[PDB]
Amino acid sequence: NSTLLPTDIVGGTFWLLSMALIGASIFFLLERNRVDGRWHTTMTLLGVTMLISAIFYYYVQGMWVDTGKAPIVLRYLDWILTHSMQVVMFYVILTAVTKVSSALFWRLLIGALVMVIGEFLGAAGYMSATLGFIIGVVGWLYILGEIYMGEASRCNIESGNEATHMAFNGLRLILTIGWAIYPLGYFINNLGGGVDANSLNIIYNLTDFLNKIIFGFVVYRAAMNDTQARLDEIKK
Amino acid sequence: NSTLLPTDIVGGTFWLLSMALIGASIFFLLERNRVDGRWHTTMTLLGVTMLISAIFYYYVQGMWVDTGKAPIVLRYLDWILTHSMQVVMFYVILTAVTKVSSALFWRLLIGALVMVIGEFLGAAGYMSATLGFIIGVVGWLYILGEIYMGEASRCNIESGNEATHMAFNGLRLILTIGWAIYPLGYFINNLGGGVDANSLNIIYNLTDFLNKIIFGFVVYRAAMNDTQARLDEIKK
Amino acid sequence: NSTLLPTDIVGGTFWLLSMALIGASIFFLLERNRVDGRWHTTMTLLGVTMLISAIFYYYVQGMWVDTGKAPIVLRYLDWILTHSMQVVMFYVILTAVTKVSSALFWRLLIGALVMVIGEFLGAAGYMSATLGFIIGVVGWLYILGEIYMGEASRCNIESGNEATHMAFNGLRLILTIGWAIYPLGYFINNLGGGVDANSLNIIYNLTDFLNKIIFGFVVYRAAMNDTQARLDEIKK
Amino acid sequence: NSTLLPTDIVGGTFWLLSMALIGASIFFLLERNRVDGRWHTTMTLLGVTMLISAIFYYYVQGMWVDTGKAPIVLRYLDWILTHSMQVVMFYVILTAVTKVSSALFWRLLIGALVMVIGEFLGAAGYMSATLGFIIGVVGWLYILGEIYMGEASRCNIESGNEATHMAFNGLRLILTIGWAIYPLGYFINNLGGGVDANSLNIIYNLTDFLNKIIFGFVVYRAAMNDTQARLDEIKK
Amino acid sequence: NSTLLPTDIVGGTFWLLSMALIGASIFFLLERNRVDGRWHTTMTLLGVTMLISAIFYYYVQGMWVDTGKAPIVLRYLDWILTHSMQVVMFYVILTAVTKVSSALFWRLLIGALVMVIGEFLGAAGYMSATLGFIIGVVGWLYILGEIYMGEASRCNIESGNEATHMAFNGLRLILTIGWAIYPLGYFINNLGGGVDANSLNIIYNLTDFLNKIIFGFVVYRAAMNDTQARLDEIKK
Ligand SMILES: CCCCCCCCCCCCCCCCCCCC
Ligand SMILES: CCCCCCCCCCCCCCCCCCCC
Ligand SMILES: CCCCCCCCCCCCCCCCCCCC
Ligand SMILES: CCCCCCCCCCCCCCCCCCCC
């Protein structure tokens, strides 16, 4: 056949994302009633995260259909909200099953905001692109230190919940690996050679499968797993 | 009268599909509360599948109204999501009533992804149309081997659930026969003489009655049947 | 004043219908939880019927606003779905309160499909307008024989439910009288002198008050009546 | 500053109305679950009334944004539905707490339909504006006689419910005073000097605060009051 | 990079606000079921406030996308509704946990309406900008006197609820500090030098994070805190 053009792929992946995310949202929000009540905030936050994301992709697809332009800087609108919601999920899931300092919520949320807002300043010309990279990468390595070596990590080890053991590990691996895409997108788009925006929209669209959807399913399986482990122990 | 033009049929069948699918979705999601809880994920997945599908048809009808073009390659956006959701339904329904290796979920989902992604590469010019056919047909014969001769089949026979006996058979017959349309659409559109896109949009629209809606109703009757069989046995 | 033009009435009645139907839908779907559970499918089907209908009217009003044309042939999109849903309601309501052969569901649904699809072929030029009339009229007299002289009738008499006695009679009278509009619309528009499309859009819009909304309220009162009769007998 | 133009006010009040009404709707529909079940139809009808109204204002604001015209005759689309729903509320609230002839429902609904349909005929040029006034005013004085001197009045006095005593009085005062706006709008716009349509749109928009929203809150407080009085008496 | 233009920021912050607010709304409305029933009106009012706000931002973003203009006077549409809903929250939260005169509801709501309507008259040219400032500032200092030195304050001290102690303080600090933005916006835009509308849209958008969202979360934590304190005391 005649190859599809990246412009055709850019637009279709906005629809794909839009659909998958509204799907994930509704699923997470209808399955909110079948998990224990200890899991209800986790599931609401999950499902709302997917919805915000979906509304972004709806806004973006219309911009694209109308104009044929979808700047990369627009991605910070989504990430200011949804990357914050995803980081704070670590706290929410821990408060479902153990006791944890509320300080942790704030540590986590600040790191997320630093990581998005720093990269947004370099991207939008308000400060050097070099500096917004460094700040974005610092705000991310902080979040990693929280979850690998900090309170969230310890709380996790000392929870005793085997559902949370698995969520923490899986969510952490997505943030460690999945979320590496964001510093690297930035590095190339800004500090490096540069990258076609079409290419980078495709990349950012296709990685929101991992970074948002698999992230969701991991949370969902924890809530489901746990709900059931509590039922299986009631039987005994 | 003066015959309707296929262009008129193409556009109306997008509306028809849109309506039927939002209908099916809402029905499946409101009837989610009247089935046993063992059936709740099945019903949520069902209803969300219908919703994704509906949102596609909404996206497509607007493209059509605006442009009068509805490429066939756009169908892979729907199928990447909804054909995967339908294949994994076999697993979901089995996990409602029996114990099944989680491996099966992945076998099933990979086959679906191979079958859609392979046919999408040949369709969009990234690899030979011949090869995307072969791969799509392989990804489909795999799914069939799963459900006719593989674990899903055995799990089904050894479940003992008579609701699931009936779902499996009916869902299997739709995949065996209903889903033959997709390899054959592809074969003709790409590897064969060729086919008017209007004609093929009509065909793909009218077969989503079977492939999506009757598929849904089959799942719904199983969940309903079973819910009731459990109530009828509680009375004794 | 200066008379409104039928074009002004055509467009306003699309809005009226749209509003009334989304209203009816939401009401039927929120009152689904206050009827017995034996009535839940009836109420979901009712409310979904109204919703499909509403989405049609939304699609049509946009076509009208944009183009000032609203072909009559577009009505078959609605009727293929909603006339089938309304005919099968007879079965659904009977299965709420008595035992009935599942065959009846199919008898009923085939008649509905014959009646819509036959008149759609004559309307869209695929077969003689004469023949599509005859077939549409045959598919309708069949449905009437079902409900006046056939199993549905007997099941109704032998149910003993006084709520269903009333629904059956009222729904039957709407199909006997209300639905006469459809053969006659067809006869005039196609086989007869002809009729302004504006006039006929107005007529079809204003009769969806009877044919859809009063039809709904009749079903709703049965479910409500019965739910209450069961509560009043529990008190004794 | 430089005065806002009435055109600017007309358009903003459509948005204001739209927002307030979708707000009221959702509130009434979520608070439907916290009132006694005897109040559930009242609350569903309330919330659906607000929703129909909101959908009107959405339809109208788009017409305005596109065209800069919002005829007054368009108001009869809303009023044919929502004035009927509001009049029949008297019956619904009485059937929540006492026994009342079903005849009353019909008396009430006919008066509403006469009052809207008569004024719509004079407005749209089908009969003399004089006569449509007289008929609209007759259909309104009838409704008033029902609720001041007729069965609804008696049923209210003989109910004994103090929540309903208060609703009836408040709803009656809105219909007596609030709804006087409609005959007077009509009189001036048609039978009298005439009135700028911008002015009259503003007036009709700002009076739907009373006539729809305060009307709603009155119903809501009755349902709430009563629900609570029944709980306070259960404690004793 | 090349700096983003304030026009680019104005449009993106409308989307940001839109997304965050629909997010907050849905979260507050799904978490309505996990708080005590004493908190249900608070949570419904909260979530509906967020929704009205979101619908505004949707209306505004379309105006902007179409026209590139977003007058500041449009903000009074939102504030007439949502500032009233936020002020009356003080009453709603007090009626959740203590007994309070219904008079307070009205004191509070009048202050809110005076504060918005006065500033809207000066803004839209109907009265001197000076006078609309004074009135807006008076309507605000009144609300502050209510909540710092008036009944609401006393009711709060005499409630004994420690969740409400915290909400009152936090909501009060947002109104004292957060809401200072509104008098000062007005002062500068109208009575003072003047201010770019782009700048002021950015400022008003970014302060609806505090003034609406943090306001919400404060209410949500009170309802959550309390619900739990009541569960923890039931255990003892
Ligand atoms: C028991 C202690 C509390 C547990 C649950 C806490 C629930 C909070 C969940 C909502 C957090 C949302 C954070 C969204 C960040 C958006 C920030 C945008 C700034 C521009
Ligand atoms: C042990 C019980 C487990 C039940 C698992 C429920 C998971 C259902 C949701 C699965 C959806 C998977 C298909 C998602 C479609 C998109 C995948 C690839 C897109 C590129
Ligand atoms: C046995 C208990 C009752 C179960 C019946 C469930 C009925 C579900 C609704 C049936 C749907 C009717 C068919 C609507 C679509 C018609 C097919 C369109 C073909 C183009
Ligand atoms: C127990 C006493 C009752 C407590 C609950 C009262 C519920 C009130 C909730 C609604 C208040 C909204 C009032 C502001 C709406 C905007 C008014 C705009 C006027 C132009």
Return contacts of B38-43, CB within 8 angstroms, 24+ apart: B38/B96, B38/B97, B38/B226, B39/B96, B39/B223, B39/B226, B39/B227, B40/A31, B40/A34, B41/A31, B41/A34, B41/B92, B41/B96, B42/B89, B42/B92, B42/B93, B42/B96, B42/B219, B42/B223, B43/B219, B43/B220, B43/B223
Distance between start and end Cα atoms, chain A: 62
Give 3-state DSSP helix, strand, coil % of chain C, rounded to 5: 85, 0, 15
Do residues D147 and D90 lie in contact, with contact meaning Cβ atoms separated by under 8 Å?
yes
Q: Do B22 and C55 touch (CB under 8 A)?
A: yes
Phi, psi of D91 (to 5 degrees): -65, -50
d(CA A18, CA B54): 12
Asked if the C-beta of D160 comes within 8 angstroms of chain C's C-beta atoms, the answer is: no
Tell me the Cα Rg of chain D: 19
Pocket of ligand 4 contains residue D209 by CB under 6 Å: yes
Classify D236 as helix, strand or coil: coil
Residue E67 contacts by C-beta under 8 Å, 6 or more apart in sequence?
Answer: none
Among B209, B210, B211, B232, residue to substitute to test ligand 3 (most atoms within 8 Å of Cβ): B209
Residue A69 contacts by C-beta under 8 Å, 6 or more apart in sequence?
Answer: A63
d(CA D29, CA D44): 6
d(CA D69, CA D53): 19
Which experimental approach was used here? cryo-EM
Q: D43: which chain E residues are within 8 Å (Cβ-Cβ)?
A: none
CA dist list (Å): E114 to D95, E83, E120: 40, 11, 10
Q: Closest Cα partner for D222 from D92, D99, D133? A: D92
Question: What is the distance in angstroms between the Cα of B144 and the nearest Cα belonging to chain A?
Answer: 25
Q: Closest Cα partner for D19 from C13, C19, C62, E76? A: E76
Burial D181-199 (b: 16+ CB within 10 A, else e): bbbebbbebbeeeebeebe
* D115: enclosing H helix or E strand: helix D102-123
Question: What is the distance in angstroms between the Cα of B102 and the nearest Cα belonging to chain A?
Answer: 12
d(CA E131, CA E120): 11
Pocket of ligand 4 contains residue E164 by CB under 6 Å: no
The one-letter amino acid code at E122 reads G
The one-letter amino acid code at D21 reads L
For the four alpha carbons of E83, E85, E89 and E91, in that order, the dihedral sign comes to positive
The pair of structure tokens assigned to A100 is: 């944890």
Nearest CA in chain D to C13: D77
The pair of structure tokens assigned to A92 is: 């929410």
Do residues C26 and C49 lie in contact, with contact meaning Cβ atoms separated by under 8 Å?
no
Residue D98 contacts by C-beta under 8 Å, 6 or more apart in sequence?
Answer: D155, D158, D159, D160, D161, D164
Return contacts of B183-187, CB within 8 angstroms, 24+ apart: B183/B119, B183/B133, B183/B136, B183/B137, B183/B140, B185/B72, B186/B119, B186/B122, B186/B123, B186/B132, B186/B133, B186/B136, B187/B133
d(CA B48, CA A214): 17
**The length of chain D, given as a count of residues:** 236
d(CA A39, CA A163): 12
Do residues C6 and C199 lie in contact, with contact meaning Cβ atoms separated by under 8 Å?
yes
Q: What is the 3-state secondary structure (H, E, C) of chain E?
A: CCCCCHHHHHHHHHHHHHHHHHHHHHHHHHHHHCCCHHHHHHHHHHHHHHHHHHHHHHHHHHHHHHHCCCCCCCHHHHHHHHHHHHHHHHHHHHHCCCCCCHHHHHHHHHHHHHHHHHHHHHHCCCCCHHHHHHHHHHHHHHHHHHHHHCHHHHHHHCCCCHHHHHHHHHHHHHHHCHHHHHHHHHHHHHHCCCCCHHHHHHHHHHHCHHHHHHHHHHHHHHHHHHHHHHHHHHHC
d(CA B73, CA B56): 13
Which conformational region is residue D99 in: left (phi greater than 0), alpha (psi within -120 to 50 degrees), or beta?
beta
Among A27, A209, A214, residue to substitute to test ligand 2 (most atoms within 8 Å of Cβ): A209
d(CA C42, CA C29): 10
Q: Which of B2, B8, B30, B36 to mutate to test the interface with C (most CBs of C within 10 A)?
A: B30
d(CA E213, CA E21): 7
d(CA D163, CA D156): 10
Asked if the C-beta of D26 comes within 8 angstroms of chain E's C-beta atoms, the answer is: yes
Q: A47: which chain E residues are within 8 Å (Cβ-Cβ)?
A: 30
Instruction: Give C106 Cα–ligand 3 centroid separation in angstroms.
Output: 9
d(CA C197, CA E28): 48
Do residues B100 and B94 lie in contact, with contact meaning Cβ atoms separated by under 8 Å?
yes
The pair of structure tokens assigned to E116 is: 């918005």
Q: Which residue's structure tokens are 């619908």?
A: E55
d(CA D184, CA D180): 6
Classify B102 as helix, strand or coil: helix
Among E45, E87, E121, residue to substitute to test ligand 4 (most atoms within 8 Å of Cβ): E45
* Ranges assigned E (strand) in chain A: none
The pair of structure tokens assigned to E34 is: 């996990």
Residue D16 CA: which ligand 4 atom is closest? 20
Which conformational region is residue E2 in: left (phi greater than 0), alpha (psi within -120 to 50 degrees), or beta?
beta
Residue B121 contacts by C-beta under 8 Å, 6 or more apart in sequence?
Answer: B127, B131, B132, B135
Instruction: Give B94 Cα–ligand 2 centroid separation in angstroms.
Output: 14
Question: What is the distance in angstroms between the Cα of B198 and the nearest Cα belonging to chain A?
Answer: 18
d(CA B212, CA C88): 20
The pair of structure tokens assigned to D191 is: 């039978």
Kindly list the structural domains of chain B, giving each domain's residue range(s) and its CATH number in brackets, ordered by start: 72-235 (1.20.1070.10)
Q: Do chains C and B touch (3 or more CB pairs under 8 A)?
A: yes
Helices (H) and strands (E) in chain C, counts: 10, 0
d(CA E175, CA E53): 17
The pair of structure tokens assigned to A2 is: 């005649």
CA D125 to chain centre: 25
Return the ligand number nearest the Cα of B216. 3
The pair of structure tokens assigned to B145 is: 């081997």
Q: Do chains A and D touch (3 or more CB pairs under 8 A)?
A: no
Residue E226 contacts by C-beta under 8 Å, 6 or more apart in sequence?
Answer: E35, E36, E38, E39, E96, E97, E161, E163, E164
Instruction: Give E152 Cα–ligand 3 centroid separation in angstroms.
Output: 57
d(CA E140, CA E127): 19
The pair of structure tokens assigned to D69 is: 């015209």
Q: Do B12 and C74 touch (CB under 8 A)?
A: yes
Asked if the C-beta of C3 comes within 8 angstroms of chain D's C-beta atoms, the answer is: yes
d(CA A190, CA A185): 8
Helix axes B75-95, B162-176, angle to 10 degrees: 160
Q: Which residue's structure tokens are 């193409």?
A: B10
d(CA A211, CA B228): 41
Burial D96-129 (b: 16+ CB within 10 A, else e): bbeebeeebbebbbebbebbbbbbbbbbbeeeeb
Question: What is the distance in angstroms between the Cα of D30 and the nearest Cα belonging to chain E?
Answer: 7
The pair of structure tokens assigned to D149 is: 């001197």
Complete DSSP assignment for D36-76:
-GGGHHHHHHHHHHHHHHHHHHHHHHHHHHHHS---STTHH
Q: Closest Cα partner for E63 from D13, A100, D62? A: D62
d(CA C147, CA C166): 13
| Specified resolution (Å) | 2.6
